Design a protein around this nucleic acid. Structure first.
Lengths: 203, 213, 144, 99, 179
RNA sequence: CCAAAGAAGGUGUUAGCCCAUUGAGCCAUAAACCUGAGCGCCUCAUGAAGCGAGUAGCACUGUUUGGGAAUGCAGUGUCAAGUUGGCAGGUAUUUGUCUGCCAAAGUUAAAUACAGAGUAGGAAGACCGAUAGCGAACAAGUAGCGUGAGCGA
RNA sequence: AGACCUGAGUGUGGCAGGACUACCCGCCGAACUUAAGCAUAUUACUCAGCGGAGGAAAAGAAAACAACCGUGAUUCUCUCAGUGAGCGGCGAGCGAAGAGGGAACGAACUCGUUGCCGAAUCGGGUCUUACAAGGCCUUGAGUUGUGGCACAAAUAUC
């Protein structure tokens, strides 16, 4: 299959050729704006697997994400209270770089709606993700049976709530039951189940 | 939960020559510097604010609920208790007064009246009817205007047959399958005057059971 | 019923029974179980010996279902028999079958002259429980 | 044809007695049966891209005769032996076919 | 704490009471009966709309999973696509006639497969399909044998058969592993 | 004297009959909604091979959890298998079996929440009764105060 | 000359922008307090800050439990259980999961891939009482792949 020969190639990323092609691309992207649109994605087999069908109302934006751990935004590095919290340049955040790369497209471009993103290049500095978006107002979409669900208002900003695949990971939702009991359906939901004090009417 | 609380109040402290309670902060109003955040302060909290999670509803053993109704009926068959429990019972032909099953056939209410006058029960329903007054209390303003004495409940086995009695002042219809203490011994006092219909009065042996079976 | 409370007899005492010298105050001793090893040591080592330390090997993820043995005594096999089955029983004759895993029990222990001879269907048995039934004219047919 | 369980609650073939049905063929059953097409596809894309750098060095440890090192170097950079013992066993046959 | 009383473990430290300050995770059931009269009113209305289709789907008789519940039997989710084939029904059809189906069930006994099949059959008989395409078109005593088995010794021997199985084979080797 | 109506509001004093209510029913009706998927009409439809890659893992660090030689997650490094494959089976390692299941793409109603929301409605309360009850029965978040955030009768 | 790719300008059609925020969902995130001191711990994965949505949200259609005569999406209640689990200066304190009785429930589906097809697709005009799930037309998009058929609830496509 065509998809195979192409997909088995992207699965050797460290090879001399996929090291070289990737290198020129890291260069070219490094010199471009954070958010930039492509006519068509750079991994067309991966964009489709993640949902990109070539139609009207299908967009692919590349994004930059500066990498590295998170330095807490506290003035002059001075944190008060007791020493357990005293660290800076020490926490790792929680959201992925990817879940940020989808939320970067979250407020900058309001009309679009986000499906999924995928890894593209990686440097000593930035990390690029190509985000696949879609239009609620496109006629080819509303009349499409498969994606017209995205037109519903419930999906309006679905990256900002962590509903995309990058947002489902850091919420712990890939492991289903017993590897996550306490975080499902969401930590705040399971925390509120367990921490209510419930009073049966007849005690 | 926020009642008697929303204020910026703090305490002035010692050295101001005044009590140490918290005081409202601001100026130019009549309540500036007035006391706050305490049950003593005009308008503070109540002492220990009431809650919705008070224990409102008590469980009762299923058995004792049965024992209690059973025990409440044995008091309905005694004319001496019923005398002092308050019902007139003067001309009542017999203690477990019992009537026909046709009583469910009435439709106009005018006929169910001359029924009650026939088994003499019209003397008690004139105790309920002449006792209606406006309450002494605050209950008037709550939605309870009038007090009535409790009347001669009538027990009809099927739900049907209600009508012909519904507007009678003070009479309480009840099914046999469902009998509750609150109408058999209202006020906790036992021996209400009951009127059993013939098909109802028969059901008891097979509802409440008997000794040994 | 707040009308029976001790507060309601204490209007006018001014001290509510908490004393004139040592007053009522707030927290005299620390809040809760605080002070186990220190200023409560007499109490926790008198009324509650054993509250401190570690014991025994460690069982993670304890699911109570795979270990279930409510047991029962030979003395107590009556109440698993309806009347008229226990009336007719004899050694060597026909005698009622008592099932346990259907009756909510598992092991069959000792402790009694079995009253009514039986054939008892039991997941688990014990040595001296075996003998008595086997000796008294019953049998033990084990199930799972 | 699985064995029937004995009515006893212990310990060889314990458990209450039923007749046991063989396992039904499931769509998941094809995971074990070899893929003849991928091994052909993963062959080209391998031949195409040359050798991974991790694979370059373990290639050489085999040449010299060091083996247990060729194992250790893969575990460190993979994390499993069944990940590594599927590696140098793949590399031992890379020297085979070239000569 | 003072006296012989038990060591209180009440866990109330977290903020729960909705003190004028905070909100607090209190769940109260004062609406219990009003939702009791509501779940009923909504079983009737659906029964009034579903008519004359039986209110709840047909579902299998199922064994309870663990050794505590083997004695017990309840109603599982679906009928297997196997058990339906025995009764003749293909799924995707029994789905419409109100037989609850689930593709994941292993039917690892026959005695369990049957109880659901004759549970299907007695349903099919009583089933009245209405004509679909058109109204006119109408498309078609306990005894005692062996006196004394010494039952216990037979329970251990099989019980301690497994328990020591590991040590018993290891010994069995390193004993005969010699020479 | 009425009661299939006793209902609890009004009126110059305490009202079944002074009034309004209280109830079977009557007329009016954008679309949606519900009924032989309501019923006719024109066009329109219709009964061999593979299975998700900077992903899963792994190491370091940090975090979070009842999760313990590491439950989940993140950062960087490293980076799979798919030729008897992969993950899970709560003590790490190696090895053989055994049981379940097929990750890294998505949509989905009800049962569930309203802990200081809103809309148009209805029920009430063993509650407070003008220093109480919302701060607010009243031209109240008003008058008044502060440069201001705010304060507030 | 012209094409393609990459990237601009303008016209034409639309949308995001703030509000609300009790509940819900992502991140960020304390201290007072408790330990009779206090630093891990607790208070707490809470208050405060930032972002987002609905009439519910989230979850969900097994890379699930169990070790059984075996259960079968998700959610929710009772119970499991303030636990002979476990975490903890093993101190203060913390603290679940499967099973079971139930609420609900016509509850499931489509992409990618593979195999066979290969523009049958989408938009725009126009016509049919019609911005038809229609006919016609259309280098306009699209072959760097839209779409049709079958994958276990299966076991030929006209």
């Amino acid at each position: 299959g065509a998809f195979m020969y192409l997909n088995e190639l992207w699965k050797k990323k460290s090879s001399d050729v996929m090291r070289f092609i990737q290198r020129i691309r890291s260069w070219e992207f490094r010199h471009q704006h954070t958010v930039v649109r492509l006519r068509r994605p750079t991994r067309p087999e991966k964009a489709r697997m993640l949902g990109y069908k070539t139609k009207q109302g299908f967009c692919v934006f590349r994004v930059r994400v500066r990498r590295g751990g998170r330095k807490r935004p506290v003035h002059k590095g001075i944190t008060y209270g007791k020493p357990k919290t005293s660290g800076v340049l020490g926490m790792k955040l929680n959201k992925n770089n990817q879940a940020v790369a989808e939320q970067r497209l979250g407020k900058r471009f309001g009309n679009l709606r986000v499906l999924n993103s995928y890894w593209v290049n990686m440097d000593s500095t930035f990390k690029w993700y190509e985000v696949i978006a879609v239009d609620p107002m496109c006629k080819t979409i509303r009349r499409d049976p498969r994606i017209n669900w995205i037109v519903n208002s419930v999906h309006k900003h679905r990256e900002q709530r962590g509903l995309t695949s990058a947002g489902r990971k850091h919420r712990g939702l890939r492991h289903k039951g017993h590897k996550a009991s306490k975080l499902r359906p969401s930590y705040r939901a399971a925390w509120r189940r367990n921490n209510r004090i419930v009073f049966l009417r007849k005690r | 939960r926020l009642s008697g609380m929303n204020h910026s109040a703090h305490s002035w402290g010692t050295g101001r020559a005044v009590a140490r309670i918290p005081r409202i902060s601001g100026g130019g109003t009549s309540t500036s510097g007035a006391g706050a955040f305490g049950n003593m302060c005009r308008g503070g909290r109540m002492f220990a604010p009431t809650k919705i999670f008070r224990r409102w509803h008590r469980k009762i053993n299923l058995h004792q609920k049965r024992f209690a109704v059973v025990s409440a009926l044995a008091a309905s068959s005694v004319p001496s208790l019923v005398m002092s429990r308050g019902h007139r019972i003067d001309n009542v032909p017999e203690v477990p007064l019992v009537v026909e099953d046709s009583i469910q056939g009435y439709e106009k209410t005018k006929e169910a009246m001359a029924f009650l006058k026939a088994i003499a029960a019209i003397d008690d329903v004139n105790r309920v009817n002449d006792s209606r007054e406006i309450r002494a209390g605050r209950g008037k303003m709550r939605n309870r205007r009038y007090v009535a004495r409790r009347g001669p409940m009538l027990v009809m086995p099927n739900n049907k047959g209600t009508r012909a009695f519904r507007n009678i002042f003070g009479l309480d219809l009840a099914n046999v399958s469902a009998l509750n203490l609150l109408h058999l011994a209202p006020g906790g006092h036992v021996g209400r005057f009951v009127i059993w219909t013939k098909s109802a009065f028969e059901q008891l042996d097979k509802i409440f059971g008997t000794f040994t079976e | 019923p707040t009308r029976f409370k001790k507060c309601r007899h204490q209007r006018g005492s001014t001290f509510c029974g908490y004393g004139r010298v040592g007053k009522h105050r707030k927290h005299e001793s620390g809040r809760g179980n605080a002070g186990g090893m220190h200023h409560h040591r007499i109490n926790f080592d008198k009324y509650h010996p054993g509250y401190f330390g570690k014991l025994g090997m460690d069982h993670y993820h304890r699911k109570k279902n795979p270990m279930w043995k409510p047991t029962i005594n030979l003395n107590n096999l009556s109440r698993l028999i309806a009347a008229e089955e226990a009336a007719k029983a004899t050694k060597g004759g026909t005698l009622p079958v008592v099932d346990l895993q259907s009756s909510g029990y598992a092991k069959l222990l000792g402790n009694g002259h079995i009253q009514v001879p039986c054939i008892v269907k039991a997941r688990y048995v014990s040595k001296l429980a075996d003998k008595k039934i086997r000796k008294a004219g019953g049998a033990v047919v084990l199930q799972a | 044809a699985p064995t029937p369980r004995t009515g006893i609650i212990a310990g060889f073939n314990k458990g209450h007695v039923t007749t046991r049905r063989p396992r039904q063929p499931s769509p998941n059953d094809r995971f074990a049966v070899p893929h003849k097409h991928l091994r052909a596809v993963k062959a080209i894309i391998a031949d195409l891209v040359g050798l991974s750098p991790l694979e370059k060095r373990v290639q050489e440890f085999l040449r010299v005769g060091k083996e247990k090192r060729a194992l250790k170097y893969c575990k460190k950079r993979l994390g499993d032996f069944t990940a590594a013992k599927k590696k140098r066993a793949k590399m031992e046959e890379a020297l085979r076919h070239a000569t | 704490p003072k006296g012989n009383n038990a060591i209180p473990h009440v866990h109330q430290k977290k903020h729960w009471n909705p003190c004028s300050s905070q909100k607090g995770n209190v769940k109260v059931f004062l609406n219990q009966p009003a939702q009791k009269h509501r779940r009923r009113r909504l079983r009737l209305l659906k029964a009034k709309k579903v008519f004359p289709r039986p209110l709840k789907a047909l579902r299998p008789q199922v064994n309870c999973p663990t050794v505590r519940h083997n004695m017990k039997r309840r109603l599982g989710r679906g009928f297997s696509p196997a058990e339906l084939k025995a009764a003749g029904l293909n799924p995707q059809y029994a789905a419409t006639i109100g037989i609850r189906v689930d593709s994941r069930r292993k039917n690892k006994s026959e005695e369990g497969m049957n109880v659901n099949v004759q549970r299907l059959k007695t349903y099919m008989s009583k089933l009245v399909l209405f004509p679909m395409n058109h109204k006119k078109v109408q498309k078609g005593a306990v005894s005692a044998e062996e006196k004394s088995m010494c039952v216990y010794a037979f329970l251990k021997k099989n019980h301690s058969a497994v328990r020591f199985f590991g040590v018993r084979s290891a010994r069995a080797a390193r004993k005969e592993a010699a020479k």
